[PDB]
Subunit: 159 residues, 3 copies
Amino acid sequence: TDARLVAYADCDEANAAIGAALALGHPDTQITDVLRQIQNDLFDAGADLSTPIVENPKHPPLRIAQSYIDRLEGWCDAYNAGLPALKSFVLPGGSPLSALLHVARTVVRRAERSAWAAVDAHPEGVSVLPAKYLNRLSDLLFILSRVANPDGDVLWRPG
Amino acid sequence: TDARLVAYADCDEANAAIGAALALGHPDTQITDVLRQIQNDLFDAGADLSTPIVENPKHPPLRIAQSYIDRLEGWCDAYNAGLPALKSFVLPGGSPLSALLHVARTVVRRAERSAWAAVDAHPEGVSVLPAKYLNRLSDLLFILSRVANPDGDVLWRPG
Amino acid sequence: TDARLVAYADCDEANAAIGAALALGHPDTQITDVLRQIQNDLFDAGADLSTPIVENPKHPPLRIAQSYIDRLEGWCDAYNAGLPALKSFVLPGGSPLSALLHVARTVVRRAERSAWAAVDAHPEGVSVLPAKYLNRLSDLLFILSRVANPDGDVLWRPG
């Protein structure tokens, strides 16, 4: 029940959600390779959160680095470039892939909350970069869900 | 990590679960329109929970009203009318649509718990109606999972 | 929001995840019967967690017993016997069934955490056996996800 292990576990749950999007959503090769890299990153993020930060110069760190986040930000900008402006707010769903990426997005957001909770529990011994990674990942998953809805998104109505 | 934002986020997770039921479960037109309306409501419910109640007469409220709950109750009664009495307790699953509606039901129940937690954290500034909506929605999703299992539900055995 | 009802609810969420694996993953007859028995057990586990332990000799107990756990352990050993040694760490995903069993595994792990939290809240009135059952179930679901990936698992890369 420790905050570190809750954050680690939520990262695993988010990773499984991405695995379901891959296995049931039939993404093309490019999107598959992006999501496969994210799964690799989420393993690293869970390892990071579960391992207290110590001044241990003896073993190679398994930690989220800023470069991981920079990569997600670049993919956000490159995939969002080819999308039109949102007319209304988006409801989660659409194509199978888009719906499954929305599920993953919401699990990632839950993992982000746990990762921040771990930082609050251990400001010195937990890195903020897993949480920042998860923050950017939820944006990327939103963008990819739109990419996977070629005929338009499901839109909220004030009605 | 605030209780309001946890409740908002769980509503989004429940909404994504409904989106997956729609996209992978192949519901007929009537059920689709019901679930699409619920997705619209869950957006409203998240907005409600995330917005503190203030005596602000200047902007149009985005709030769950009793009418939302009355509608879910009416759909419960109308869909349950055409179902036989339960012989045993139901296990979640069956047809793809029924299984996905059971997943959604369990996420909705989690969202309900968070929505009550937000009320407990802010009895004056959080509405009870999102939680009551989520309570009735879990009943409706149970009923719809049975509707989507024309050949019978999966039943628990004392054995 | 009581710890007992959170644990009960997480068991239901895990059960629904297994129901989705059954309905969307097309398991063979043997695996289906194993997962169907687990669903029956998870109903019992939720009932156990939600019912305070009292010295009530008057009604038949609905409780997880050690035999439930022994059964899961036996299935772990029998299914793992026919698998090769892991070369690297596994990422969740692969075949549809494997991916859905990984989702279920991660929900089961969340349910395990809640079940331990219920024990901590009520050391005298809550059984430890639901939590121990959920612990062994996550192992079994991992093993079954590998069984369902005949062409190999998705592997983490240090790269």
